[PDB]
mmCIF file of C-alpha atoms and ligand atoms in Angstrom:
data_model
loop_
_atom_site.group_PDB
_atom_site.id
_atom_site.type_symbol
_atom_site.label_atom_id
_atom_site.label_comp_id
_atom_site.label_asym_id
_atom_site.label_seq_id
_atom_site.Cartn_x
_atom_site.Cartn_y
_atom_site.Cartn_z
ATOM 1 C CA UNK G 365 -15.337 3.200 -31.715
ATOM 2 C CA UNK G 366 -14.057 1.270 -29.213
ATOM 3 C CA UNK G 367 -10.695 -0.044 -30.666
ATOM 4 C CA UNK G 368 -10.157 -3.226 -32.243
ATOM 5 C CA UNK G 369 -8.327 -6.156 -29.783
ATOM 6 C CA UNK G 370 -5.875 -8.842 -30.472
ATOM 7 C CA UNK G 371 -5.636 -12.065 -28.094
ATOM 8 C CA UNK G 372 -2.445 -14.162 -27.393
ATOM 9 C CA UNK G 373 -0.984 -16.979 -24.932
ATOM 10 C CA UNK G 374 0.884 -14.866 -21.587
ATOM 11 C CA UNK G 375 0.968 -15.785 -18.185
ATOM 12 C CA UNK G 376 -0.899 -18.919 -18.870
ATOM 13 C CA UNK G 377 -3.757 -17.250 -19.918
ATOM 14 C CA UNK G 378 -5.690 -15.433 -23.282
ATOM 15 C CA UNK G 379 -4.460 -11.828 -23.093
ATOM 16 C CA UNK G 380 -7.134 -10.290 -25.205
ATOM 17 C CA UNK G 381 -5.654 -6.470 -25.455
ATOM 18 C CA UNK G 382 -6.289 -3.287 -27.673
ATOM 19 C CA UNK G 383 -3.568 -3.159 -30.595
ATOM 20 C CA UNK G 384 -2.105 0.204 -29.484
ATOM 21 C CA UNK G 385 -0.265 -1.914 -26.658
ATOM 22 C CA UNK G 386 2.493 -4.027 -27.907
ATOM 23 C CA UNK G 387 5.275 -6.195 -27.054
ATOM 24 C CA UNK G 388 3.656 -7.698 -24.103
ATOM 25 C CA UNK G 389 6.145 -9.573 -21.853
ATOM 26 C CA UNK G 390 5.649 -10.854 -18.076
ATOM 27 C CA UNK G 391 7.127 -9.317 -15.111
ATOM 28 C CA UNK G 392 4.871 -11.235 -12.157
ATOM 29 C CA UNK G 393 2.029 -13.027 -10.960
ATOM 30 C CA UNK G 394 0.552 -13.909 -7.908
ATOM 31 C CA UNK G 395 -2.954 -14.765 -6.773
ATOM 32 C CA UNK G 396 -4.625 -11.273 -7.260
ATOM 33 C CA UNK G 397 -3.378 -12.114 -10.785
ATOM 34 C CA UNK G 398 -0.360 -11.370 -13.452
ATOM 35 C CA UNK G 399 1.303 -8.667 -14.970
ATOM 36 C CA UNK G 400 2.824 -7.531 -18.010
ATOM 37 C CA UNK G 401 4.808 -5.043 -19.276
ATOM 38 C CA UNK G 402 4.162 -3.200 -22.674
ATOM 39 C CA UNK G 403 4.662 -0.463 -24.748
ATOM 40 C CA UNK G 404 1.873 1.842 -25.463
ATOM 41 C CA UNK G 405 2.112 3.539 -29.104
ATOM 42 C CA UNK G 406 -0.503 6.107 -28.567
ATOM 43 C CA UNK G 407 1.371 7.698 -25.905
ATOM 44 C CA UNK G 408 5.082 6.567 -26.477
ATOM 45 C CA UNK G 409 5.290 5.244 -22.658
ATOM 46 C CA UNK G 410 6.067 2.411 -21.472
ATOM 47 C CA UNK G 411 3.689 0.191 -19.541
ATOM 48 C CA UNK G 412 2.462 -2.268 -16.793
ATOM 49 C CA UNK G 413 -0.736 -4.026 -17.640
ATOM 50 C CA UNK G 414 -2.753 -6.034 -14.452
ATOM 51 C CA UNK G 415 -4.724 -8.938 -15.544
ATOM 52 C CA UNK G 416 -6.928 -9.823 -13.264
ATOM 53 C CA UNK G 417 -8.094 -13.323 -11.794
ATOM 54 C CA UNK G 418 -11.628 -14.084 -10.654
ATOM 55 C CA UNK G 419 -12.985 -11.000 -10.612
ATOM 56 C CA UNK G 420 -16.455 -11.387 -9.902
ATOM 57 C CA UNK G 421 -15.982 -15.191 -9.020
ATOM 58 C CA UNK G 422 -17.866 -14.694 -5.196
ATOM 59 C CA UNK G 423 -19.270 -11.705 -3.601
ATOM 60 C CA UNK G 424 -16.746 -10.952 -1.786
ATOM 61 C CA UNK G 425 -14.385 -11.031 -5.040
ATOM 62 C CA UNK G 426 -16.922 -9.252 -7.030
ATOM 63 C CA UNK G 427 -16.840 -6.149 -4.397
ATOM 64 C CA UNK G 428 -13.034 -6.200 -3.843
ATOM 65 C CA UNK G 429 -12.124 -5.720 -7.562
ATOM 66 C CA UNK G 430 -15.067 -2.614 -7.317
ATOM 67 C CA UNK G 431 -13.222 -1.551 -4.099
ATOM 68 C CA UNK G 432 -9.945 -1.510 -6.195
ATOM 69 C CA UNK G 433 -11.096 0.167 -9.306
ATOM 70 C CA UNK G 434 -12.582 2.464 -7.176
ATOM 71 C CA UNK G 435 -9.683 3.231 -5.672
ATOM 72 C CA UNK G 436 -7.104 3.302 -8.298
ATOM 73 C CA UNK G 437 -9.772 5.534 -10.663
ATOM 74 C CA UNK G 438 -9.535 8.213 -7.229
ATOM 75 C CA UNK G 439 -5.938 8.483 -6.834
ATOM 76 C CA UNK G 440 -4.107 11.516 -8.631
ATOM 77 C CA UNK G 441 -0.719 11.948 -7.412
ATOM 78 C CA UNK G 442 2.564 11.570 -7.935
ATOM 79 C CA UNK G 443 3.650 9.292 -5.319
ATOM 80 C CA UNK G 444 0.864 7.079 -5.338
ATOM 81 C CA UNK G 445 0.023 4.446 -8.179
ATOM 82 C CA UNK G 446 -1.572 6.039 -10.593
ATOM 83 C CA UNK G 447 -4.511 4.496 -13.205
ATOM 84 C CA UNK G 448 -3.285 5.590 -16.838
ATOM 85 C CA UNK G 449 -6.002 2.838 -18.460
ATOM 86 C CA UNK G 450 -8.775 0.416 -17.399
ATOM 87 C CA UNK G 451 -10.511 -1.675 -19.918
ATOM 88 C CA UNK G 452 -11.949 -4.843 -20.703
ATOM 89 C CA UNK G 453 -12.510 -6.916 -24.315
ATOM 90 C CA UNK G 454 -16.636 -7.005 -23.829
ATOM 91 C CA UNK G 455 -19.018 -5.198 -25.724
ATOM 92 C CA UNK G 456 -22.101 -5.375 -23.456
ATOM 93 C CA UNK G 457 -22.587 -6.234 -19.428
ATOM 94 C CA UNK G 458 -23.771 -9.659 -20.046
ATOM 95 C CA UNK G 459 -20.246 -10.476 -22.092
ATOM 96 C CA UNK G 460 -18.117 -8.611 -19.421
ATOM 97 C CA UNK G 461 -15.931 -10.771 -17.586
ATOM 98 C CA UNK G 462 -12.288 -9.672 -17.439
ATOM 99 C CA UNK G 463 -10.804 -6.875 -16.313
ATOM 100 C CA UNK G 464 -7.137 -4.834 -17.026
ATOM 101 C CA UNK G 465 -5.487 -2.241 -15.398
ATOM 102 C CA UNK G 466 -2.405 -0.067 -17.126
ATOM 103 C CA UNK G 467 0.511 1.957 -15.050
ATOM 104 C CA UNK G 468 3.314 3.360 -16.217
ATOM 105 C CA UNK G 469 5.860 0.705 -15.976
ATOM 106 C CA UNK G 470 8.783 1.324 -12.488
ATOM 107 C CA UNK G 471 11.957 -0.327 -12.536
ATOM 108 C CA UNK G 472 12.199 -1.805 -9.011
ATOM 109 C CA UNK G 473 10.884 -1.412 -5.503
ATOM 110 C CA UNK G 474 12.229 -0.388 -1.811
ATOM 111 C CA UNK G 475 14.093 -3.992 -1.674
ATOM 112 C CA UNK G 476 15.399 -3.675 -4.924
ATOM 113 C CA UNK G 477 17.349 -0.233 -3.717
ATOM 114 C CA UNK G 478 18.564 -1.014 -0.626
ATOM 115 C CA UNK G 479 20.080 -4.162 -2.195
ATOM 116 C CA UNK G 480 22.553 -2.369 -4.697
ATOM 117 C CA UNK G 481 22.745 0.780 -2.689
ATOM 118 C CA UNK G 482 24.252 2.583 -0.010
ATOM 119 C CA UNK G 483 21.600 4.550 1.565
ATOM 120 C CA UNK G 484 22.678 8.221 3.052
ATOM 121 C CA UNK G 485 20.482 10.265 4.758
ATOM 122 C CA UNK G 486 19.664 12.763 2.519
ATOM 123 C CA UNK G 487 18.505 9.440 0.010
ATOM 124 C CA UNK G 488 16.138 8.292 3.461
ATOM 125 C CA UNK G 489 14.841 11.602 4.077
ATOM 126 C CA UNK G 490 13.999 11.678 0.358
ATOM 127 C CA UNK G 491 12.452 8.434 0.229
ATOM 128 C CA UNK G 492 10.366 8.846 3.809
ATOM 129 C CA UNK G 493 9.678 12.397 2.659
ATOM 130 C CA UNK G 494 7.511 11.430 -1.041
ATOM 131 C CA UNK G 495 5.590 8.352 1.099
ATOM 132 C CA UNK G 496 4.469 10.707 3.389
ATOM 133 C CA UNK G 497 3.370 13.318 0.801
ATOM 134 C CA UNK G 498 1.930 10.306 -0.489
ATOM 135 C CA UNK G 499 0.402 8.842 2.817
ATOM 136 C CA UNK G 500 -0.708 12.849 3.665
ATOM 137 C CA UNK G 501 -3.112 12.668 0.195
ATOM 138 C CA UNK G 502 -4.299 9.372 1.026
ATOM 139 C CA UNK G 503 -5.385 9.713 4.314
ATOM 140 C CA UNK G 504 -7.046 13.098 3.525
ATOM 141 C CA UNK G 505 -9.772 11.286 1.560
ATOM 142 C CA UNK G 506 -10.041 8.949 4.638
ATOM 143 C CA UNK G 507 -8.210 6.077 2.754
ATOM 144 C CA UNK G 508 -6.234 3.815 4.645
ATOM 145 C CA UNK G 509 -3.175 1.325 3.156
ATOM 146 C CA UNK G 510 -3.150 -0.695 6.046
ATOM 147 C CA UNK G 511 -0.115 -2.852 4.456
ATOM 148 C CA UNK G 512 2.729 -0.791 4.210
ATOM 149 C CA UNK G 513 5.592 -2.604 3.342
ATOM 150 C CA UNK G 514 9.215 -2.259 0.644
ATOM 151 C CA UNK G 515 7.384 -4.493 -1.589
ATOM 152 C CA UNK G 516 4.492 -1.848 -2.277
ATOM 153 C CA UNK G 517 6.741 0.579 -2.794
ATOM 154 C CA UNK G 518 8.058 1.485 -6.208
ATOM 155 C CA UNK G 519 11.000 3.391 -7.147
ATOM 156 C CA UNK G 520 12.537 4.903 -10.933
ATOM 157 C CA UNK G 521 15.717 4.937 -11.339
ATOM 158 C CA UNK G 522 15.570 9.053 -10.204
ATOM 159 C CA UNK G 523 14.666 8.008 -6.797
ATOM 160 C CA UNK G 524 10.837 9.190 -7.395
ATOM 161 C CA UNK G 525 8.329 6.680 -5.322
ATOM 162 C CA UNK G 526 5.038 5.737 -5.534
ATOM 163 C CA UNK G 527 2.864 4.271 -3.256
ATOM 164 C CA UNK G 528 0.760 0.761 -4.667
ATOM 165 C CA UNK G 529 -1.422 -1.909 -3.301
ATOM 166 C CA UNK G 530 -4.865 -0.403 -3.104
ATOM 167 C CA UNK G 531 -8.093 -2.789 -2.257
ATOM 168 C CA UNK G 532 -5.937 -6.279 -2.429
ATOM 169 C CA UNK G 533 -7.320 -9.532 -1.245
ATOM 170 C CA UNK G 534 -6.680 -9.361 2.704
ATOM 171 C CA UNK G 535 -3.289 -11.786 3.418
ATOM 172 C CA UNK G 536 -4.396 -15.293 4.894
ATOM 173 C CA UNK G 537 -3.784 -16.331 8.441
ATOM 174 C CA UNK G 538 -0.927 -18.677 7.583
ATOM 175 C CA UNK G 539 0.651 -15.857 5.045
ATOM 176 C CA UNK G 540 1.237 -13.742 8.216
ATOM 177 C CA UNK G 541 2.734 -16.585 10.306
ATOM 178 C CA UNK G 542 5.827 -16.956 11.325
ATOM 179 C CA UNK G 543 9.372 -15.462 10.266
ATOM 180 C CA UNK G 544 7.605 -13.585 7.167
ATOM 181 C CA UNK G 545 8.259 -10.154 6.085
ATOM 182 C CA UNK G 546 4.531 -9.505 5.372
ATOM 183 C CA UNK G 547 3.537 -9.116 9.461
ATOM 184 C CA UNK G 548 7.188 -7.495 10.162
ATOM 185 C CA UNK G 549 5.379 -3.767 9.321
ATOM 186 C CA UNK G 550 2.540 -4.145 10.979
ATOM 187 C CA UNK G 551 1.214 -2.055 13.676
ATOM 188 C CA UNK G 552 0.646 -3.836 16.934
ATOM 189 C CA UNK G 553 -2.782 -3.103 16.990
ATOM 190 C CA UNK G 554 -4.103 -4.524 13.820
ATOM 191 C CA UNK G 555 -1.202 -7.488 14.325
ATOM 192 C CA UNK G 556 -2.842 -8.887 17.482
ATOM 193 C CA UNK G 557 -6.616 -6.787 16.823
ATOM 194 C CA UNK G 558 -6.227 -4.662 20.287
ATOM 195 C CA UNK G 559 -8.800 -2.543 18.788
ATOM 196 C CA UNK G 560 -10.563 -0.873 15.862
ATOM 197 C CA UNK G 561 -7.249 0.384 13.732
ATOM 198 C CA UNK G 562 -7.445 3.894 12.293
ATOM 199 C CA UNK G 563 -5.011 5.390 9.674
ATOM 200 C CA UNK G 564 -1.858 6.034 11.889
ATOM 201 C CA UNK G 565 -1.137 2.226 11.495
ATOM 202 C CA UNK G 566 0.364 3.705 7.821
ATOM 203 C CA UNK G 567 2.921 5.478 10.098
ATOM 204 C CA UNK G 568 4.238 2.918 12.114
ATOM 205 C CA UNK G 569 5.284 0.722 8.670
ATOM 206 C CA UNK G 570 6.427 4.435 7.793
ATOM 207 C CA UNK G 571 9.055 4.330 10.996
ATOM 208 C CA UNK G 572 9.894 0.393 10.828
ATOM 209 C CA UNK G 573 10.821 1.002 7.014
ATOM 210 C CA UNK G 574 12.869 4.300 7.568
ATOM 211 C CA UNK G 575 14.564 2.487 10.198
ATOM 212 C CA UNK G 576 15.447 -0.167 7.875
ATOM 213 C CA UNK G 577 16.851 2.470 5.676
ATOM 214 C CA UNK G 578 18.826 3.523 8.248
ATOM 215 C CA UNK G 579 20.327 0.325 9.665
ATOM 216 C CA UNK G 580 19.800 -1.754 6.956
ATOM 217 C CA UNK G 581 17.990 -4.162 8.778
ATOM 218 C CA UNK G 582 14.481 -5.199 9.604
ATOM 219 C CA UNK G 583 13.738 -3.570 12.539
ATOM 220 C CA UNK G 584 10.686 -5.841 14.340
ATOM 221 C CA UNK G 585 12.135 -9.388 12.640
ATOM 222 C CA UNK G 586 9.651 -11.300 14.895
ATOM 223 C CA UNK G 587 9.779 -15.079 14.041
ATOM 224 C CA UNK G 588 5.921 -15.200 14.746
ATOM 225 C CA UNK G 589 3.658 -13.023 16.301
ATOM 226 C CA UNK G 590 4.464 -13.225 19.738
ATOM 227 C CA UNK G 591 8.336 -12.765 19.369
ATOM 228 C CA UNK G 592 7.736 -9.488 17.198
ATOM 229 C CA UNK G 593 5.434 -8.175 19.983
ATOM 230 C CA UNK G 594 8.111 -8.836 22.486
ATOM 231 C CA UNK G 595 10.600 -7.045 20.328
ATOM 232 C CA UNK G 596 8.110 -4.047 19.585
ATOM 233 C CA UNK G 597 7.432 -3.445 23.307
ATOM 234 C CA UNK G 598 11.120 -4.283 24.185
ATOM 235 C CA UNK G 599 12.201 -0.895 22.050
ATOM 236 C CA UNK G 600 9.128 0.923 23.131
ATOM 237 C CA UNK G 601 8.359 0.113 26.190
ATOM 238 C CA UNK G 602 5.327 -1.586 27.689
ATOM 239 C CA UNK G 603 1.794 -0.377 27.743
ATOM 240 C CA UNK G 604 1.076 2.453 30.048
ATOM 241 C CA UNK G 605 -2.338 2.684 31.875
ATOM 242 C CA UNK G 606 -4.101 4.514 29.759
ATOM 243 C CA UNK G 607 -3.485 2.866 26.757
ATOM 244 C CA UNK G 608 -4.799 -0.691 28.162
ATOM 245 C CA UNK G 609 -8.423 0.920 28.516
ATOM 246 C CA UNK G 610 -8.082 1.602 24.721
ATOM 247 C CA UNK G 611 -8.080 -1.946 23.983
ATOM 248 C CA UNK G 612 -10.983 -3.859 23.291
ATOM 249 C CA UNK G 613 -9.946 -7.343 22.939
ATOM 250 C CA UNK G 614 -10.675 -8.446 26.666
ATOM 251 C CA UNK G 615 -8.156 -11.483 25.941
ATOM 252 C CA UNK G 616 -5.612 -9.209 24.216
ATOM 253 C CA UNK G 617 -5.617 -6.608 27.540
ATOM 254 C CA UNK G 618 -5.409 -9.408 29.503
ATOM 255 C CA UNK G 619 -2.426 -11.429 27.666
ATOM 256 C CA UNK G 620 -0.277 -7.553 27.947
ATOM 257 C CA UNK G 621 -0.439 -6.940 31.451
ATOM 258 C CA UNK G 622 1.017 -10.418 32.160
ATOM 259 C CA UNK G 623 4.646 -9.285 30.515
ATOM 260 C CA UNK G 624 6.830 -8.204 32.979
ATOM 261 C CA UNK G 625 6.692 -3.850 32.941
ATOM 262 C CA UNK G 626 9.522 -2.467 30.300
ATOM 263 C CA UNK G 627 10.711 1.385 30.068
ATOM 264 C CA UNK G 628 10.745 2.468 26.422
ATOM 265 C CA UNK G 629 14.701 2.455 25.140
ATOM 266 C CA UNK G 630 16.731 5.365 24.713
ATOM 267 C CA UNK G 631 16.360 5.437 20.360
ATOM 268 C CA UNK G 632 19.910 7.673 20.289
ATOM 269 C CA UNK G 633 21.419 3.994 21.614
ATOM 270 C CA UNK G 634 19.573 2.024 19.610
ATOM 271 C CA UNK G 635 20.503 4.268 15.676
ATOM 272 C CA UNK G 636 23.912 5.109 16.568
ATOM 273 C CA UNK G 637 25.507 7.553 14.607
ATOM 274 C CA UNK G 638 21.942 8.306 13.060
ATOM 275 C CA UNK G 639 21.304 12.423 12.268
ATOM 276 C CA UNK G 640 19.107 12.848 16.018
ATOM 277 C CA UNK G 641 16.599 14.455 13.717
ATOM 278 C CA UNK G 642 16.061 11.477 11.763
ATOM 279 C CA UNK G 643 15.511 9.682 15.825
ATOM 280 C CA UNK G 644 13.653 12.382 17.070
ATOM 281 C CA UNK G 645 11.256 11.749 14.349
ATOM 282 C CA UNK G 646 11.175 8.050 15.053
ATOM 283 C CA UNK G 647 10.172 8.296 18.256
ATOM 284 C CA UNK G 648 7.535 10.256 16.932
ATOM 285 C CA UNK G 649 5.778 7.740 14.624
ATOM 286 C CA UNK G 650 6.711 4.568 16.615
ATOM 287 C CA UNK G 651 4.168 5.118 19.406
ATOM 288 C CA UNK G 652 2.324 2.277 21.182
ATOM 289 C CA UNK G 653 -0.684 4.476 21.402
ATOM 290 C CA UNK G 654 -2.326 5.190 17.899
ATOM 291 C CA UNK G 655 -3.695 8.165 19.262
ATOM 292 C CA UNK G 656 -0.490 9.806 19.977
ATOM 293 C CA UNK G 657 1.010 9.079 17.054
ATOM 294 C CA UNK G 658 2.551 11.578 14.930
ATOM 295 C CA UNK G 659 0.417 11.788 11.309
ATOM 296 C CA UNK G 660 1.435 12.566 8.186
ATOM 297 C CA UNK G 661 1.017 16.200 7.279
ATOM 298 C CA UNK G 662 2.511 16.491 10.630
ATOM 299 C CA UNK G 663 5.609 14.840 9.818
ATOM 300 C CA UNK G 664 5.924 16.458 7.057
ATOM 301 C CA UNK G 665 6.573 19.798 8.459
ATOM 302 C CA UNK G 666 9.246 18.203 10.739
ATOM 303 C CA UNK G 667 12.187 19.542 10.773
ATOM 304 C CA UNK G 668 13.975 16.673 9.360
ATOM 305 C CA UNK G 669 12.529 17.245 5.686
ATOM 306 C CA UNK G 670 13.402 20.537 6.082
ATOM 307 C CA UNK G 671 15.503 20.535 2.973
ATOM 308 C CA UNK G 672 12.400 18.659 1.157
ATOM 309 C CA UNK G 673 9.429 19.917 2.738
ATOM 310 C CA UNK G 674 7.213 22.543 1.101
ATOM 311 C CA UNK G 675 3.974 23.462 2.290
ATOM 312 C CA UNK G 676 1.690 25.143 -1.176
ATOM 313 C CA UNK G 677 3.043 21.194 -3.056
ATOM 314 C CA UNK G 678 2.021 18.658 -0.437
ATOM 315 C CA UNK G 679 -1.428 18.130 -1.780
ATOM 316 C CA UNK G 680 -4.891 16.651 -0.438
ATOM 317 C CA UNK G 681 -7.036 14.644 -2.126
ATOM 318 C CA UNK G 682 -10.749 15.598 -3.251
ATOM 319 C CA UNK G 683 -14.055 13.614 -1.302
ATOM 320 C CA UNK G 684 -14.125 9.912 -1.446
ATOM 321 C CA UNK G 685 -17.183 8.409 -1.137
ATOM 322 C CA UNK G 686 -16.808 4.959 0.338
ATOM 323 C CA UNK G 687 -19.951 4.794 1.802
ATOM 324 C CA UNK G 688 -20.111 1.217 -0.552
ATOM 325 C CA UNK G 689 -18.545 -0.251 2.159
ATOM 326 C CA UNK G 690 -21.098 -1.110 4.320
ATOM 327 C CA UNK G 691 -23.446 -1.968 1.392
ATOM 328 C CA UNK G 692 -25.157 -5.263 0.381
ATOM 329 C CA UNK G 693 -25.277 -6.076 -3.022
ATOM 330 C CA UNK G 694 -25.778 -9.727 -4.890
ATOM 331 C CA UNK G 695 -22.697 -10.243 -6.924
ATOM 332 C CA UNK G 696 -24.581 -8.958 -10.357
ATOM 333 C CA UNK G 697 -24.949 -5.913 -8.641
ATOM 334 C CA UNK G 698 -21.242 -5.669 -7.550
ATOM 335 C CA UNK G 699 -20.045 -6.464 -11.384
ATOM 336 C CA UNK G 700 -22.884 -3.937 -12.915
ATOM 337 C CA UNK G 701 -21.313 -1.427 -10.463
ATOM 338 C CA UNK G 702 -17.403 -1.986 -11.971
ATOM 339 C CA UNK G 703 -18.647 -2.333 -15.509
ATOM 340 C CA UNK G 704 -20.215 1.530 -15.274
ATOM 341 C CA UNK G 705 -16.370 2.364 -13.713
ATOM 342 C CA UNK G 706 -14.807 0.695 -16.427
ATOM 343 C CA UNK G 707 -16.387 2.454 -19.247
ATOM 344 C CA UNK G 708 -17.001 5.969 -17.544
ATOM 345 C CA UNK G 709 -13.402 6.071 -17.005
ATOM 346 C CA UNK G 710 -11.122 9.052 -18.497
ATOM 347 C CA UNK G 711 -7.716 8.960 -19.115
ATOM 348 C CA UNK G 712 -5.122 11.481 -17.634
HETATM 349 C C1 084 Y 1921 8.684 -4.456 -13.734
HETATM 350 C C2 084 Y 1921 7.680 -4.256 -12.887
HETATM 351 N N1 084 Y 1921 6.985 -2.950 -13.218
HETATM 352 C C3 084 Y 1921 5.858 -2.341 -12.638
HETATM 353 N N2 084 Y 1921 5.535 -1.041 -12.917
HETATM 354 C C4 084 Y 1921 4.404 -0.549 -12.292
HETATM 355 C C5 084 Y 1921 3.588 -1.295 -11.400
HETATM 356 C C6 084 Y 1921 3.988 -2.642 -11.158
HETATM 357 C C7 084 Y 1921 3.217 -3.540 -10.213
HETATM 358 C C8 084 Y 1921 1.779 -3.835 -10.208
HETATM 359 C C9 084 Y 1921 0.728 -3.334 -11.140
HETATM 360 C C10 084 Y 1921 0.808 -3.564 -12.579
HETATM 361 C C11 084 Y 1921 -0.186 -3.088 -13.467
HETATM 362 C C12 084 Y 1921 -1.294 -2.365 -12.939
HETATM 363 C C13 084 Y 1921 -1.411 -2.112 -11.494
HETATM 364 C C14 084 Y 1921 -2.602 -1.337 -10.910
HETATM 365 F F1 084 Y 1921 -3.187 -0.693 -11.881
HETATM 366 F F2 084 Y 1921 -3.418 -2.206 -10.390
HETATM 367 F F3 084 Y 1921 -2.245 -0.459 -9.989
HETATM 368 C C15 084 Y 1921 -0.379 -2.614 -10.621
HETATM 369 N N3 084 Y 1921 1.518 -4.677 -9.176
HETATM 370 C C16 084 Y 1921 2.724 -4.888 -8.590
HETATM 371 C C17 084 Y 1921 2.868 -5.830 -7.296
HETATM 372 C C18 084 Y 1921 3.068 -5.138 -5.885
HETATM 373 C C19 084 Y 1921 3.159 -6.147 -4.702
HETATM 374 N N4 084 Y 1921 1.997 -7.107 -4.690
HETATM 375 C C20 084 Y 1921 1.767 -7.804 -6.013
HETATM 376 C C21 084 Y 1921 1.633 -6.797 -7.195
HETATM 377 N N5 084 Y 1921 3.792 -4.242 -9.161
HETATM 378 C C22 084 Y 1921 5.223 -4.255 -8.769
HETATM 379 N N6 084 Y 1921 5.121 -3.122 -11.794
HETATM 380 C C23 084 Y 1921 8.110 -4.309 -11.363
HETATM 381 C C24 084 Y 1921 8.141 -5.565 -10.632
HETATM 382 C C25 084 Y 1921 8.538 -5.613 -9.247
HETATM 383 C C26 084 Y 1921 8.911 -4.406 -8.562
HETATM 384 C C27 084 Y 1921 8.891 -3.149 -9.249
HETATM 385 C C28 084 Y 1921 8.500 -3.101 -10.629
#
């Protein structure tokens, strides 16, 4: 029983489908691969349908679609992407060779509302407030986004976010160089390697996108890398002593403590007019040192949610195993392990 497909001509390749989803029309494409949107009669919703492109092309291709099945299969909440469908036109392992991925379908993301809106506070802390419920059930099953950014983040027309971008190719060297909005999020410490990252580099793209919200303008708009440092530290102040032990990169320590010494900014001159709450809590997540930096569930009980926040519906996320991660497998091995996800997959 598994139910009869239909092929057809769509983002220049053979869309090969089950019948129940119809209309198919494309909204995107990139390199990861393209997107449609459809409707799906069994369940009256509306849909976005993934496509993707070499899947199991290298080894390293074979184990990042795995990584993000696995990932999208885990996630069960409302304010990050969630998996309503996964399936593929083959009828046996040796056949299997493409793989599709169904969402519901959003209307627009973070750059798409700031664009024909007019932002207030209670709209930020609304916004902020669902990505980190979101960020708090993602990094309680030790998962880590490592890319947040407005163009991962997807908004209905209700204001209701979700979080997306799980397991996607890493970004090439020259994709981050520059005056690009794809480094302007990052964390210093993954943008120049000081060290081995951990999750808290989710909340510093948390603060430079709330900021954004607030000012309506990029907050870190470094025209390469060493321009944005010189604008992060400029705001935050240098690196104090202990926080140059903490990095690794010999080169990296060294390069820092050749910038003349900076005192971090007072952030009530920098947001002016900005609810002190909403700059207390900035000062909070935009930390130099990772360490110190305030995490999600903490921020969520900060008193600038207040109005949002609620304790017994800010929910954690049950065991992920990633121990595949540090597991060598021949590229057969890496497919046979998505094909038993594919078809052991059950619907919400
Ligand atoms: C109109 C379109 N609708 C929509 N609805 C839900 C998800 C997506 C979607 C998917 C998508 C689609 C199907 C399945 C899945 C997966 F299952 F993998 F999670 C994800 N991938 C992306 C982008 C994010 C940035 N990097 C490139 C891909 N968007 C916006 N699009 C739209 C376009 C632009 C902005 C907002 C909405």
């Amino acid at each position: 029983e598994r139910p009869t497909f239909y092929r057809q001509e769509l983002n220049k390749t053979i869309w090969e489908v089950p019948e129940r989803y119809q209309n198919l029309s494309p909204v995107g494409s990139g390199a990861y691969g393209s997107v449609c949107a459809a409707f799906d009669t069994k369940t009256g919703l509306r849909v976005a349908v993934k496509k993707l492109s070499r899947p199991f092309q290298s080894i390293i291709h074979a184990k990042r679609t795995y990584r993000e099945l696995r990932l999208l299969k885990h996630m069960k909440h409302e304010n990050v992407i969630g998996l309503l469908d996964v399936f593929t036109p083959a009828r046996s392992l040796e056949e299997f060779n493409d793989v599709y991925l169904v969402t519901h379908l959003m209307g627009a993301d973070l750059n798409n509302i700031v664009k024909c809106q007019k932002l207030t506070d209670d709209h930020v802390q609304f916004l902020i407030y669902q990505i980190l419920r979101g960020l708090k059930y993602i990094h309680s099953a030790d998962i880590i986004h490592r890319d947040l950014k407005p163009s991962n983040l997807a908004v209905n027309e209700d204001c209701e976010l979700k979080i997306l971008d799980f397991g996607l190719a890493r970004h090439t060297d020259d994709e981050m160089t520059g005056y690009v909005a794809t480094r302007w999020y990052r964390a210093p410490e993954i943008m120049l390697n000081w060290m081995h990252y951990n999750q808290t580099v989710d909340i510093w793209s948390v603060g430079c996108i709330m900021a954004e919200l607030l000012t309506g303008r990029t907050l870190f708009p470094g025209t390469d890398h060493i321009d944005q440092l010189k604008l992060i530290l400029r705001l935050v102040g240098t690196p104090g002593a202990e926080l140059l032990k903490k990095i690794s990169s010999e080169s990296a320590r060294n390069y820092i403590q050749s910038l003349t010494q900076m005192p971090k900014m007072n952030f009530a001159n920098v947001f002016i007019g900005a609810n002190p709450l909403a700059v207390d809590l900035l000062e909070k997540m935009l930390v130099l040192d990772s360490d110190k930096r305030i995490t999600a569930a903490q921020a969520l009980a900060h008193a600038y949610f207040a109005q949002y926040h609620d304790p017994d519906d800010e929910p954690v996320a049950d065991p992920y195993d990633q121990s595949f991660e540090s597991r060598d497998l021949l590229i057969d091995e890496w497919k046979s392990l998505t094909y038993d996800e594919v078809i052991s997959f059950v619907p919400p």
